[PDB]
Amino acid sequence: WTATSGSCKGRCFELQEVGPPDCRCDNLCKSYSSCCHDFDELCLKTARGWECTKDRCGEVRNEENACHCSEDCLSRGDCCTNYQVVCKGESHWVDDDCEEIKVPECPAGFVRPPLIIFSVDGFRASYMKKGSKVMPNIEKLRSCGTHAPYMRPVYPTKTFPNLYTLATGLYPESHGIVGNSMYDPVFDASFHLRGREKFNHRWWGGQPLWITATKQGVRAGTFFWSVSIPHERRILTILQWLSLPDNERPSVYAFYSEQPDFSGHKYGPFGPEMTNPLREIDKTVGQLMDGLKQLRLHRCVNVIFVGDHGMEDVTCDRTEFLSNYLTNVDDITLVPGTLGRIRAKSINNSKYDPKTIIAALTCKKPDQHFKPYMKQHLPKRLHYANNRRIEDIHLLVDRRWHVARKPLDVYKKCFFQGDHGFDNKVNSMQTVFVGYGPTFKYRTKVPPFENIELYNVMCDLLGLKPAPNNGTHGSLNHLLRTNTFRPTMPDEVSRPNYPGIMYLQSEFDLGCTCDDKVENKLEELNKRLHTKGSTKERHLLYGRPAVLYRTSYDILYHTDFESGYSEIFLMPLWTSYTISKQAEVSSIPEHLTNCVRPDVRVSPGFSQNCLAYKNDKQMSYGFLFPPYLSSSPEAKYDAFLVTNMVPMYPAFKRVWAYFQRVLVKKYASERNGVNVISGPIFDYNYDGLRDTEDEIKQYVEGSSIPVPTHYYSIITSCLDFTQPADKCDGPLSVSSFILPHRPDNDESCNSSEDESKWVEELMKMHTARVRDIEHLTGLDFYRKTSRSYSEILTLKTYLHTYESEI
């Protein structure tokens, strides 16, 4: 109930929330069906439209009018945004040359540059170039301020997950808004775009920027707008708030536009109908900047122009139907469209089986346009598993397509030409970022980055301490003239042991054999020097990784590679090696096919054993430093040490062997050498974070050898590829992956073919940031370079996407 009989007089667009049942006068009262009886009359005036005309200049004030052109309007803060242009001879902001804003130029009483976030739904990144001719205000922001060529949304590339990620810095699995539609099995409640459940605060996790600001005494404008409030009124309300007395005035403001998404769904991303929505958004930017100019705030405010996601061409005819795969289609509930999520229709049905559903959906039709995954097997870069609202079965749908349960859902539940939601590396899903104002840089292009990083920067712009989030604070310092956040590298928690030769061969009873016993003064000294680290500068290029948790581990040096060997997990945490452009690939010699060698620096008790692999009929092993890339026949023996061995399913060894034997040398040829760091990952609870020893669900049969969920590699070279990776003077270039360690290659429909036709495709799908590997391993990389720390933070957030040019 709401007592709608109260009044909005003197309260229009009031900032504090009045609790039930008193009626409301704020931005969102319409959405809550709670506005006072007189809200439209007093607060949504429309008389005489939105623009001054020559004949209104100097007019006697009529409070009925939507905005004013009377001589008192500037003191009242309610002029039409074009007032000074029409009545006072001024220029539109867009017509002024851009001039660097070196310092804020703010009116007296302003404690900090205000932040205005101007958000656009469905604004695909390529609109900034493709629509530039019809968006002069936006083009001026972009060209004169700081801009990225695009900004990467979060998965799923839907509106509410992305808007809330912008506001919180968190992945959807952490903030809880994992889709526009959700079922939470603990609440037994459904969240939808339609209806009241979505208003319950229990859905909304983390801490959004307006709450961060408020808790730290920085006032925020009301954070969002009821859809029926016209854009012109939203801009006028923001400008009105900016004229409040100092003690009452917000420091952070948000505008949101439902366009171009609304038309893009109807017309497709480049429908000819799309020009007009782009012009109308540009005109709204122009109203804002003109309004700011009138208030003398156009060289004071920081403006962020940012979108939530792009828009792809999708039509009704490109729909896959689960009814063409499943016999039991009425026993499941599907959340449909550009992603699929499947769960049992009834919790009382004991004949629901997820394995049979996945199997029936796997590589069943030649051009099949979706792929099923259990959620833990989704690419780790999606960070889309650790929430009870994310169903165990997920369908990744190809761009341009939909999935639905049955055909009747598509015509009795056609018209649309655009949609979004797909994998957040897809080019059509990328969106926009421009920052303009005194705290942003001038005429500066920055590389693409992810929208999870912006919350920290918005906090930086407001002088706020961010709530804990998934950005990497400092990684976006290059967007900023001032207010940078200067992080310190985390402290190493565990220091390594450096074992020498401590064990004789016969102390080992590992069940391993090797044909290595065929036989000096200076030659033996030389190999003693390798074991003490004499080649470590060549193979450990950026320092050893720091271990940021408590554990017991050994550094092991070799001619061709260096490792940090865990005494607890019985394998390396990391193995580091450099491969020059000139390196040569060799075979594993016949007499060494099954060679595994005890490591006389590591006790039998802290070693793997070969008998466990013999007896585990599902599990084989591989090596982290590749035997194929040994520098000499003699150095090759080091690659068969038991301290370089890791458990690998035979299906995964197909993938791993091709990467090691073919791809590493390809990357070294293309990049002028590469440095590789490889290792295992254990994430059995799919939380994106390193497992402790007691979270491990699978061991090599009969042993304490834990089985990795994933294997990673970080592949670094010189950004200026005229310098070899091992003699690089400047910025670095990286690409990395986190490959699922699976017992089959059912993900790869073409896996019966030669690895050359499918392995690299698999690897590209599981591309990763160095930071993702950091979270999964408790390691900290790039500790010793000549590069600034914020630059290394940006390198660690880089994702190699393999999409062609935007």
Ligand SMILES: *[C@@H]1O[C@H](CO)[C@@H](O[C@@H]2O[C@H](CO)[C@@H](O[C@@H]3O[C@H](CO[C@H]4O[C@H](CO)[C@@H](O)[C@H](O[C@H]5O[C@H](CO)[C@@H](O)[C@H](O)[C@@H]5O[C@H]5O[C@H](CO)[C@@H](O)[C@H](O)[C@@H]5O)[C@@H]4O)[C@@H](O)[C@H](O[C@H]4O[C@H](CO)[C@@H](O)[C@H](O)[C@@H]4O[C@H]4O[C@H](CO)[C@@H](O)[C@H](O)[C@@H]4O)[C@@H]3O)[C@H](O)[C@H]2NC(C)=O)[C@H](O)[C@H]1NC(C)=O
């Ligand atoms: C991205 O960044 C985010 C933010 O930094 C990272 O998420 C953090 O990671 C931590 C580890 O996973 C996690 O820490 C836990 O917090 C528990 C208290 O949680 C509440 O309080 C906080 C603070 O206000 C709040 O933010 C939380 O919000 C979560 O839960 C609510 C529901 O109440 C949701 O609305 C909200 O969206 C969010 O859910 C998300 O996180 C939870 C986990 O908290 C997931 O389950 C969800 O799926 C979703 O992802 C909460 O309101 C605290 O109790 C935990 O402590 C346990 O474990 C530690 C281990 O150190 C142990 O010491 C304790 O004994 C304790 O164990 C006991 O509980 C166990 C579980 O029941 C039990 O088995 C034991 O036997 C014990 O009884 C723990 O500290 C932190 O909450 C989240 N924060 C957020 C916002 O998500 C994220 O990791 C980053 N991602 C990556 C990849 O880097």
Ligand SMILES: Cc1cc(C)c(C(C)(C)CCOC(=O)C(C)(C)C)c(O)c1
């Ligand atoms: C301060 C501030 C900051 C940010 C980032 C926004 C945006 C633009 C992104 C929108 C957030 O809306 C959400 O989160 C929903 C709850 C509506 C899904 C805002 O309104 C206000």
Ligand SMILES: [Ca+2]
């Ligand atoms: Ca984990």
Ligand code: NA
């Ligand atoms: Na085996």
Ligand code: NA
């Ligand atoms: Na396959």
Ligand SMILES: [Zn+2]
């Ligand atoms: Zn949309």
